[PDB]
Paper text:
In an attempt to unravel the structural basis for the inhibition of p110β by the cSH2, we crystallized full-length mouse p110β in a complex with the mouse p85β-icSH2 (residues 423–722) in the presence of the PI3K inhibitor GDC-0941. The structure was refined at 3.3 Å resolution. In the overall arrangement of the two subunits, the long coiled coil of the iSH2 slots into the large arch formed by the catalytic subunit, while the cSH2 nestles against the C-terminal region of the kinase domain. In contrast to the nSH2 of p85α, which is in contact with three domains of p110α (C2, helical, and kinase domains) (Mandelker et al., 2009; Miled et al., 2007), the cSH2 of p85β contacts only the C lobe of the p110β kinase domain. Our structure shows that a cSH2 loop (Ala674 to Tyr680), which was described as a protrusion at the surface of cSH2 (Hoedemaeker et al., 1999), forms the main contact point with the p110β. The Kα11/Kα12 elbow is marked by Ser1046, which is at the center of a hydrophobic groove between the two elbows, including residues Tyr956, Ile959, and Leu1043. This hydrophobic groove accommodates Tyr677 in βF of the cSH2 (SH2 secondary structure nomenclature follows the description in Eck et al., 1993), and Ser1046-p110β is positioned to form a potential hydrogen bond to the side chain of Tyr677-p85β. In contrast, the pY-binding site on the cSH2 is exposed and not buried in the interface with the p110β. In our PI3Kβ structure, the C-terminal helix folds over the catalytic loop, presumably locking it in a closed, inactive conformation, and His915 from the DRH motif points away from the active site.
They trigger a cascade of mammalian signaling pathways downstream of receptor tyrosine kinases (RTKs) by generating the lipid second messenger phosphatidylinositol 3,4,5-trisphosphate (PIP3), which recruits effectors to lipid membranes (Engelman et al., 2006; Vanhaesebroeck et al., 2010). Consequently, p110α, p110β, and p110δ need to be tightly regulated.
Numbering used by the authors:
A (entry chain A): 13 to 227, 235 to 298, 320 to 401, 432 to 513, 525 to 1057
B (entry chain B): 441 to 500, 507 to 575, 608 to 714
The structure:
Amino acid sequence: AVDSQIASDGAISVDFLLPTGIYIQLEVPREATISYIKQMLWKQVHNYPMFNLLMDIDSYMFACVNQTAVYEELEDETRRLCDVRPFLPVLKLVTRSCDPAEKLDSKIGVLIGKGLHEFDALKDPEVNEFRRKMRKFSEAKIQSLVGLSWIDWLKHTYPPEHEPSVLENLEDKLYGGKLVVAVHFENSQDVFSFQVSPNLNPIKINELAIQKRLTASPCDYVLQVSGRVEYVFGDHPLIQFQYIRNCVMNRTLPHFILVECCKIKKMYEQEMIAIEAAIIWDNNNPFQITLVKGNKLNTEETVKVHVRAGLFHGTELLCKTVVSSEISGKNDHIWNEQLEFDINICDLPRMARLCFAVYAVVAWVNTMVFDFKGQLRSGDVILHSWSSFPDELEEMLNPMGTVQTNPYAENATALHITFPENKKQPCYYPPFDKIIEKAAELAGKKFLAVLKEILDRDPLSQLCENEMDLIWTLRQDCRENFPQSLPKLLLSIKWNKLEDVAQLQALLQIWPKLPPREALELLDFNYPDQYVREYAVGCLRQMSDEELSQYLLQLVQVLKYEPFLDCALSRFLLERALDNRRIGQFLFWHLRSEVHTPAVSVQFGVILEAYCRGSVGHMKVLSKQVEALNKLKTLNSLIKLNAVKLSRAKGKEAMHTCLKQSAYREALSDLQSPLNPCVILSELYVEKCKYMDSKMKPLWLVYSSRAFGEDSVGVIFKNGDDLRQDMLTLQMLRLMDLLWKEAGLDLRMLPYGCLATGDRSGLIEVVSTSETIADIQLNSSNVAATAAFNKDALLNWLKEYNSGDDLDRAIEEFTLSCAGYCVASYVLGIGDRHSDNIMVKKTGQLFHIDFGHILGNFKSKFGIKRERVPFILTYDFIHVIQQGKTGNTEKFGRFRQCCEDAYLILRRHGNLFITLFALMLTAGLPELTSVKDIQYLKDSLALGKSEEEALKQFKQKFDEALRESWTTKVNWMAHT
Amino acid sequence: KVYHQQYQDKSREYDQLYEEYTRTSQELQMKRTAIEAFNETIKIFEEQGQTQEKCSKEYLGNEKEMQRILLNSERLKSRIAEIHESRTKLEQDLRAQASDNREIDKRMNSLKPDLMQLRKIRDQYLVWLLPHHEERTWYVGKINRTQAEEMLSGKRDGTFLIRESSQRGCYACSVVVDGDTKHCVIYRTATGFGFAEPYNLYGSLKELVLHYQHASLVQHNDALTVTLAHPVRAPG
Ligand SMILES: CS(=O)(=O)N1CCN(Cc2cc3nc(-c4cccc5[nH]ncc45)nc(N4CCOCC4)c3s2)CC1
């Protein structure tokens, strides 16, 4: 009833607002083409006065208000009325040539899901101060793009991936030095094969490509990966390019298409056509805050009144939990009091966070002492509180929570407050330079042993006072031997006084840069300083886009933490996303996925448009997808409805006809995968598309990659479920695969693609030739269907698809993938895994699938609880590893070796895991609620105990699972 | 004066509040979305009022068009009417749902300190910071299947009387399955004892027995069904 999308068939009464104010109501069919309606209205235009001040149809286009308050100018006259669901039936006929570059501002608001006026409607300075700041920079990139010649543009739009020395671990999975690469020309039907040195530059393939007698420069051509907007070029060795590296790594044939410069020039020119559419310190006195009234009607039996205060700098408090005057906790809410803050106004951190709450035994507002330009927040300010939003644990007053206030005024809490405005000349933060001068004016081989025992304990482990003292005492010594210790040191000194702060800031400038993996810690709650953060990102800024894309999820979640807007991180992420290899897309997608939620709506919203703006070109492709996804949401909504009155097989047909229709085959076809920005989507293999048995009936889309792409692509669209736990646990898995390969361990893992695109919406990527172990087991002749329905089903399965030589690799790939998963599961504490959620590819590769819960036991939202996930092994894995072969000590020993080796590798980068899971607290996952949650890892990884004291523990755990090998095998599918 | 009796039933009262609140807050932003959209639609109809009045002043025949325009201004007047009412009824339903959520923070935040008070009692609750057990009951030293089948025949369909194998320095396990007696080889290895290579991590031939009275024999052989409920020396 809030929108027209429910079971209804016929015509609709729409309002047509003409340029001459001529109002006309007409009954128009619901699923009518917007051009058909434009034509329809035009018929009756004359039976209404003023019929002559109008121009022809083709000089005018409709405009509307979306289901999201956005004014949608509908240029594409081919869209169905319902396919562009206007909130109210009304359509304002406007002139097609409405060129004010507010047609751009339409296009943007539409993409994002927030109308740009909303930022003006806030009227608050910073939003406007920064929208305008970014717009300057966004438009500088658009300008950077204009000069650029062919190929140089590609380096700015889709830059090739480089990976030096990764081969110095694993060598030559090629017959001799020679690499086998495949190339064919643009619309050519004949391919050519080449035997090539992996150390050559891509140009040699072009030189080889031209060696085809049929009668241009090799430089006038470019190598595009066949079926992807992925390109390979540059004065670099073939093996160095991530593409090649992968084909080499998975013994796959690199597929290249040769594009003539004029075809990339063409794309550049069509994109540049759209680009043209761009038309005091010395205040030695104490600090105190005065406030007036509140606004609660709430009543309590055991306790009457409620009122609190207090101030922090991250986790560290700078004052005691200040209380307030008791009023009427059942009736009267109005009052006044001068709030005592036993802290000097001079010795105050510019990143100080003034927090407030009430006696919970109930709401909260936390607002910063300083503002966007470091001006002392003074004068009368209103604080819109977060009622029933406090978390179970907070240390009386919550310091973690947002500084950005509640969007609701009516029937949502508020607070009145005043700060010392007094003087006509205000007080601003001490300069970025003046604090170094403050430090310059102010001006261990034995210890090497002690501090190594201090500056080691995991990021979540908080030091005790005496340790803090020595860390600061021997601060210069550790700077020289333990540079990686600054995270510990930065927490040693109390931020209460400026003298230490100055010396601390001095250290940072003269402190070396820690690696990006390390730097990441300096972006959590612990470190809120505007200069440590400026250096933290400093290090990130010196990281690859491929390395960047890795920690991107949680980097976005740090934007959620950020108290301001023009921060170095936002500036960095946008700076990076505007030069994307595929970065920009995820940056963009991850942002919409949360813009729907109040607290981030302004945050992400602004950042989003700032991207859209610097992405005037690509903009089309992102929209192509947004439309593609909406069409899916609806088809799914209809699929849910169908499933009731429709047979499993009749609802399939229903789905198939729906896809085959004009609206679908256009929208959700031939426009780029949101999961992989490089992967092209092209024609759907409709006949093979399906919907799953599940409670949300998710679609299973198959994309026959037509002529050029070797095989088919397969997506899963799932609306109704939180696809973020998977999105994070799959990313965690991608890391383990990273780390093991790093150390030297290709356990042939499959962390398949996953992206949550919005609220309970998103995509899972399909892995080709795969199968659920339950599926493999049933529907098989179980030892002539006589005994144990389970044994060797999984083996014969592999035997079926692997011939002689192939069977060895199959079982080899099975082993380490199983090993890799066995460790990674336990370590990440992935629970309630059954033969319904473990899978096997036809390559022998094993992998996991339903990530409902991590770092504790799975219990539904109503009664969410925790439990240790033991290491588990099924008889079914051993049996395959074994081959059934009664006695050995080389294969089920190779397994245990890997299992041990892997578990040990993870231990080493245990801090990397705890840091990422710590930055993922802001994201708001039902699991990740507190640091008590990340504490699971410390245990799983045996982080205190030494390598061999901890190996022994796991060596036991592994054997104990071999004891429960059939016992667990039973739990996998007996009742299940 | 009350101490530890229960907890679990009052614990789940939080979700009885939170499951409906999360749905209600979600509906409130959804209901506010429409008022923004509604209030934005009006803006377009309002602009029409201005344009129809400005475009009408264009009289550059004038008598019949005086009322035809007037009628249409007065119908356009009547549209913005029903759409101001339509917006107001939704604005009334926001006020309702929002009022209900305030009477829920009156219930939610009142039961939250119940666990905070529990902390002093809850975290202080501290105290801490088989007939196979006999060797001879199943062991039968140096024997032959012939002499093993002998004893076991007549006994219950799940008895254990373990011999010593024909094979040099090995062992065997003679067992009465649901039907009759079956004999499998148990092995010695540095890893321990057990019927098959990856599954032979048993320090003693007894701790094995003790870990196979619980677990089935089926894994090593489909033929070998039943575990070990009775060794030798039954009551009565
Ligand atoms: C014919 S039918 O589809 O109607 N029917 C229902 C389910 N089917 C088995 C499967 C279930 C399944 N669920 C998931 C999933 C479920 C929920 C959350 C998830 N996150 N990631 C995967 C996933 N992910 C899957 N893929 C597999 C390979 O690429 C990868 C995923 C598969 S394959 C067969 C019988």
